[PDB]
């Protein structure tokens, strides 16, 4: 159970030792020395210590074997982006088994000086979370506010995490801008998997960041139906990434072993188990209430006016913090784990738990509408959007309808205004009124930004009274799909062919088509190729040939860069086996 050394077999000159290691020791670079009874010390070599989830008495232990492979031995992961309705997978290379990633992680860890807790990975997780959050605050650049679409391909292209770590530690690489600040979770997952703690990145859609302890968010809309001013303290973000670690809590009461969300504080970090979040144990960790409020919060809207006096309005309720998803186990399909955080909606358990929450905190329509909009918009395309209005009164009434479409960042930051329209209607004898309109890519007053989501706001103003109705929707923009053809199986040291095709579904001619391929264990670093013009109706097809070298399950990803858009990514997996003897 402690350090020991037993000679397994002895020969004339060769001796075999099977050295035992303690189940909980300080990790780092070690040195082995030998002392003779009389003579001096002689050095043997160096070695490195890591955790392992294969030991049942270790603090880190996972019962399943495949789950160890995905959460510790996998190097090609997926990140889920988009809105809650449409999900996009992006292939990421964590690359935790690179040559010098361990050196970077150890060198960064060496700035703690609490050496006695280096054998306890809870403290290690806390200090690394704090350090990475501070470094992210240090090294993330604000976006260049100037308009240069020609060089957008070199500003938003990602090649994995190893670089990000190299640029954050040494500052000798391509820096990262504020438009992609969700990579912090990926960096944390990479370094944690490097140290031997399994971790995984989850994505929460429509998460209310900002406010601490409140379940109410105020949003103020302009008189026209737009957003007056810019920014807010706490807003509803489009999505949020976070890191989850599998660990046992020895200092905590019984029943909290398992998954823990790592949440840094604006430095200092900490982590909280999932079940504690579900029950609502707010006195268990200072960072419980703020995280809990972000998964179920209410928003109310004030409609600004010319005088400036704000009046509360009746608006349609929106869902906050729903459809939590992550990478599936053993496959490439998304899996939802939102049930681990919340009770089922419209049930008892959520009702009593929430009412306990309110109690704990306090101790311390004649007309309306509903609207149908598509969940996505094809690039350079069009879509029809409908709204229906109903009134409930014996008399007629005049109404004023205002509709606006504007871009927004992924963290609730506005980008630009895109479209506006106003009309007037009259409802009589409580008859339904349906209005379907078309919206085109040519109707925009400017070019929408590269990484933004559209938000549409509809405002119905009642002429006689002051109460008025509001609604909004979130739309994403979908880009043309590209097809990849390649065999599911292949043999080592043999030629392999792949084909890629695309149909130009846009309305503009193609020029400067550049496509690149890459993949770990299949190709070298990356390879790029030119192309000719594609007209708005034709299809382009190409083929590539290579030779796999590393056995097992690999994958390769291609990306297309163009004049209309940048970084159009796709990927495909494959299995390669040893040659037949």
């Amino acid at each position: 159970k402690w350090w020991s050394a037993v000679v397994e077999e002895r020969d004339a000159q060769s001796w075999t030792i099977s050295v035992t290691t303690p189940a909980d020791a300080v990790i780092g670079h070690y040195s082995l020395l030998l002392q003779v009874s009389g003579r001096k010390q002689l050095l043997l070599g160096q070695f490195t210590l890591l955790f392992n989830p294969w030991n049942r008495e270790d603090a880190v232990f996972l019962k399943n074997e495949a789950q160890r492979m995905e959460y510790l031995l996998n190097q090609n992961g997926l990140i889920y982006l988009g809105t809650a309705d449409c999900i996009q997978a992006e292939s990421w290379d964590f690359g935790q088994f690179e040559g010098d990633v361990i050196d970077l992680s150890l060198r960064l860890l060496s700035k703690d000086k609490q050496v006695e807790k280096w054998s306890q990975p809870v403290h290690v997780a806390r200090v690394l979370g704090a350090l990475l959050h501070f470094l992210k605050e240090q090294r993330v650049l604000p976006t260049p506010q100037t308009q240069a679409t020609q060089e957008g391909a070199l500003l938003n292209k990602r090649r994995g995490s190893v670089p990000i770590l190299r640029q954050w530690l040494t500052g000798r690489g391509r820096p990262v801008y504020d438009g992609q600040a969700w990579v912090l979770a990926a960096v944390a997952c990479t370094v944690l998997r490097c140290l031997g703690i399994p971790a995984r990145v989850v994505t929460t859609f429509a998460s209310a960041q900002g406010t601490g302890g409140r379940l109410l968010i105020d949003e103020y809309y302009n008189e026209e139906g737009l957003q007056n001013g810019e920014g807010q303290r706490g807003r509803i973000w489009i999505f949020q990434t976070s890191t989850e670690c599998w660990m046992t809590r020895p200092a905590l009461p019984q029943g909290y072993d398992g998954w823990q969300i790592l949440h840094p504080s604006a430095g200092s970090c900490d982590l909280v188990p999932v079940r504690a979040v579900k029950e609502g144990t707010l006195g268990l960790t200072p960072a419980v209430s703020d995280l809990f409020a972000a998964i179920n919060a209410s928003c109310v809207v004030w409609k600004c006016c010319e005088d400036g006096t704000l009046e509360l309005t009746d608006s349609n309720t929106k869902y906050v913090g729903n459809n939590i998803s992550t990478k599936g186990v053993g496959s490439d399909r998304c899996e939802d784990i939102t049930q681990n955080y919340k009770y089922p909606e419209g049930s008892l358990q959520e009702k009593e738990v929430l009412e306990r929450v309110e109690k704990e905190k306090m101790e311390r329509s004649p007309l309306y509408l509903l609207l149908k909009a598509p969940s996505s918009l094809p690039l350079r395309g069009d879509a029809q959007i409908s709204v229906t209005l109903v009134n409930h009164s014996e008399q007629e009434k005049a109404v004023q309808l205002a509709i606006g479409v504007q871009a927004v960042h992924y963290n609730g930051v506005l980008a630009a205004k895109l479209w506006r329209k106003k009309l007037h209607l009259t409802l009589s004898a409580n008859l339904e009124k349906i209005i379907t309109i078309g919206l085109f890519f040519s109707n925009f007053e400017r070019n929408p930004p590269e990484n933004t989501f559209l938000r549409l706001t509809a405002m119905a103003t009642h002429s006689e009274s002051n109460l008025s109705c509001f609604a909004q929707e979130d739309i994403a923009i979908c880009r043309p799909h590209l097809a990849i053809k390649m065999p599911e199986k292949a043999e080592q040291y043999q030629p392999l062919t792949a084909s890629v095709s695309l149909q130009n579904s846009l309305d503009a001619p193609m020029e400067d088509c550049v496509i690149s391929i890459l993949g770990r264990g299949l190709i070298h670093r990356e390879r790029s190729y030119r192309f000719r013009s594609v007209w708005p109706e034709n299809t382009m097809c190409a083929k590539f040939q290579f030779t796999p070298t590393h056995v097992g399950l690999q994958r390769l990803t291609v990306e297309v860069d163009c004049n209309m858009f940048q970084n159009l990514t796709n990927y495909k997996s494959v299995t390669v086996v040893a040659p037949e003897l």
Binding site: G160, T170, G173, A542
Partner: protein, 311 residues
């Protein structure tokens, strides 16, 4: 109709593939092999021909290594070496453990830069993976004679003077343990392979530095391999692949150059180190002066050149 794209090159994202690790310092043992054919059986194979443990050691037709000696070069050797290194293909920090994978990646990179035509891939790959004999089996073979790769693969005699090399002729006409004692314990191997292919159109050079040293099973060397050179091409005037390999070995014999190769991250650094090496070399014309006095008059200029070398 299915169609292929045009190769494009850019340096937009090379920065992502630069390591922060120290390459480390090692001595290097340089080894040279060439493709020849043995009179016993009509089959091509690679013979070792020279080594650079401390000085250049040459192996004759009988199979006895001569006296280690100075590595003297020729003007043409360095001339075409620079000419082919100027537009060569390099593969840095490759992660492989077999000769087959290295060959496949190098062939793919050659096809990427149009150094070789696609239809020569199979033949070159097959020729690169033949069995690698050693010095001991020469007595089991009884001698070899030079040959050249052919489209059909059938060996033929080259249509060029096949006279023996002058270095062997002038330095030939217990050793493994001796060289193992001479080499430092921390030394890594560098391999150069030379040969001739008739269906090619231009000599091609390939430089490979592995991410870490490995002991390839295909060819036996006492120490793991870190660097590797490939020389191929058709027959041209004023060229000699043996002297090209000798010049490559002598270039590898420099401490500063191998340091630069260890820290190298692009072809430009290797090129710059190559011009730096070329600047500090001197040429001795054919003169009728006494040899010993001419060599003894060399000490001040060579001392100044070496003094200028270390900046």
């Amino acid at each position: 109709q299915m169609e292929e794209p045009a190769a494009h090159d850019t340096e937009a994202t090379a920065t992502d593939y630069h390591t922060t690790s120290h390459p480390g310092t090692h001595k290097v043992y340089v080894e040279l092999q060439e493709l020849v054919m043995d009179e016993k059986n009509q089959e091509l194979r690679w013979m070792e021909a020279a080594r650079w443990v401390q000085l250049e050691e040459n192996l004759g037709e009988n199979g006895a290594w001569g006296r280690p000696h100075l590595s003297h070069l020729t003007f043409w050797s360095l001339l075409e070496l620079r000419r082919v290194f100027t537009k060569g293909t390099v593969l840095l920090d490759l992660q492989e453990t077999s000769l087959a994978g290295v060959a496949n990646q190098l062939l793919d990179r050659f096809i990427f830069e149009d150094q070789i035509r696609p239809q020569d891939r199979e033949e070159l790959l097959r020729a690169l993976l033949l069995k690698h004999s050693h010095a001991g089996e020469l007595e089991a073979l009884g001698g070899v004679k030079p040959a050249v790769l052919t489209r059909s693969g059938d060996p033929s005699q080259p249509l060029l003077p096949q006279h023996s090399s002058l270095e062997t002729q002038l330095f030939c006409e217990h050793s493994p343990s001796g060289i193992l004692e001479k080499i430092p314990p921390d030394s890594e191997a560098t391999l150069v392979l030379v040969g001739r292919a008739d269906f090619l159109e231009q000599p091609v050079l390939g430089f490979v530095r592995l991410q870490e040293a490995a002991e390839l099973e295909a060819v036996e060397l006492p120490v793991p391999i870190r660097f590797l050179f490939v020389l191929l091409g058709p027959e041209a005037p004023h060229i000699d692949y043996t002297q090209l390999g000798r010049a490559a070995a002598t270039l590898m014999s420099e401490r500063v150059f191998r340091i630069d190769a260890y820290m190298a991250q692009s072809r430009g650094e290797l090129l710059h180190s190559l011009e730096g090496f070329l600047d500090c070399s001197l040429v001795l014309p054919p003169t009728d002066a006494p040899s010993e006095q001419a060599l003894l008059s060399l000490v001040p200029v060579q001392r100044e050149l070496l003094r200028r070398r270390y900046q």
